[PDB]
């Protein structure tokens, strides 16, 4: 026919006859997710109502507002009254999609908007929220999954700088696992978390992993090489303190260390002579630098550690 294709909110197209019929009306045809719909409108721009029937006897109504600014796609049961789904989209790309349960209440609601923020919600058979995933215009998000009892089972909060906190709870809704991912990608992993707040810790750094424990007061990661044990403590405030302990009583080879929290540096000494500086950086790296053989001042440049063995080597 002489028809015009018209683009519609919601990534749909309608075809509207160019010629009015005897009654002053225009025929409309449109395929939406493979299904052909049809209507007759008194308007000639693509607005109006189209209808179609699916092979499962479901009934589909598309309503297009006068100014083409908004479309409503409804899916009904075979009675053409009981709702299955409804999708409303605007010209600015904002849209709400709703799926209905046999009760006639929402089982799913999903809004996606202009700035590309969105909210996705599932509702259980009680009418209660069972999952919520919200994404923001800066790509931050929060995800919550609840269990049948309505307690939290899984939670992830992701920030705009890409840092995140991921939590898993057991079947009683108690915290079991927590991953804290930093903005730079490094991670603190807490597993086997117990009622008393202690558990296993790992810090995942770029190239290597430290292991340790969590207690009520702090996280302490430990590297041991022979008689020497290095401990990195992270306090509740995020404050780091480092300790070195050497079970070697030999005055000639025993390591002792002095921490400086102002410079986040542990200085190691052997036989009254400084041997190296281990610096615990705000960038979640560890550098090692040696002194000269008199122990007077640092030589060379600091080397950034990328493997656990390098830490071990520094403690020999």
Q: Rounded to an integer, what distance in angstroms lies between the CA atom of residue 72 and that of residue 285?
A: 54
Report residue 162: phi and psi, to 5°. 85, -5
Report residue 224: phi and psi, to 5°. -120, 130
Q: Rounded to an integer, what distance in angstroms lies between the CA atom of residue 234 and that of residue 164?
A: 18
Neighbour-count burial of 50, counting CB atoms closer than 10 A to its CB (0-12 exposed, 13-18 middle, 19+ buried)? buried
Report yes or no: 12 and 64 within 8 Å, Cβ to Cβ.
no
Rg (alpha carbons) of the chain, rounded to whole number:
32
CA angle 122, 124, 129 (to 5 degrees): 55
Q: Rounded to an integer, what distance in angstroms lies between the CA atom of residue 273 and that of residue 248?
A: 16
Query: Which residues, in sequence order, are CB contacts of 85 under 8 Å at separation 6+?
Result: 73, 74, 75, 97, 98, 99, 100
Q: What are the chain's domains? A: 1-78 (2.40.128.160), 79-217 (3.90.930.1), 218-316 (3.90.930.1)
Technique behind the model: X-ray
């Amino acid at each position: 026919k002489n028809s015009v294709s018209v683009d519609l909110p919601g990534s749909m197209k309608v075809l509207v006859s160019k010629s009015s019929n005897a009654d002053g009306k225009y025929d409309l045809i449109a395929t939406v997710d493979a299904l052909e719909l049809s209507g007759t409108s008194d308007k000639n721009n693509g607005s109006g109502v189209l209808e179609g029937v699916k092979a499962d006897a479901s009934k589909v109504k598309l309503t297009i507002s006068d100014d083409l600014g908004q479309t409503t796609l409804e899916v009904f049961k075979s009675d053409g009254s009981t709702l299955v789904s409804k999708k409303v989209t605007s010209k600015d790309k904002s849209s709400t999609y709703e799926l209905f349960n046999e009760k006639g209440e929402l089982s799913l609601k999903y809004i996606t908007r202009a700035d590309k923020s969105s909210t996705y919600e599932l509702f259980n058979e009680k009418g209660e929220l069972s999952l919520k995933y919200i994404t923001r215009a800066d790509k931050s998000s929060t995800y919550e999954l609840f269990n049948e009892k309505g307690e939290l089972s899984e939670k992830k909060i992701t920030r705009a700088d890409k840092s995140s906190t991921y939590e898993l709870f057991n079947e009683k809704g108690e915290l079991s696992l927590k991953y804290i991912t930093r903005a730079d990608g490094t991670r603190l992993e807490y597993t086997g978390i117990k009622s008393d707040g202690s558990g296993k810790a790992k810090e995942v750094l770029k190239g290597y992993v430290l292991e340790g424990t969590l207690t009520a007061e702090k996280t302490t990661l430990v590297v041991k090489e022979g008689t020497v044990t290095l401990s990195k403590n992270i306090s509740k405030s995020g404050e780091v303190s480092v300790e070195l302990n050497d079970t070697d009583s030999s005055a000639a080879t025993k390591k002792t260390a002095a921490w400086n929290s102002g410079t986040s540096t542990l200085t190691i000494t052997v036989n009254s002579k400084k041997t190296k500086d281990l610096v615990f950086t705000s960038s979640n790296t560890i550098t090692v630098q040696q002194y000269d053989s008199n122990g007077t001042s640092l030589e060379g440049s600091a080397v950034e550690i990328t493997k656990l063995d390098e830490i071990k080597n520094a403690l020999k």
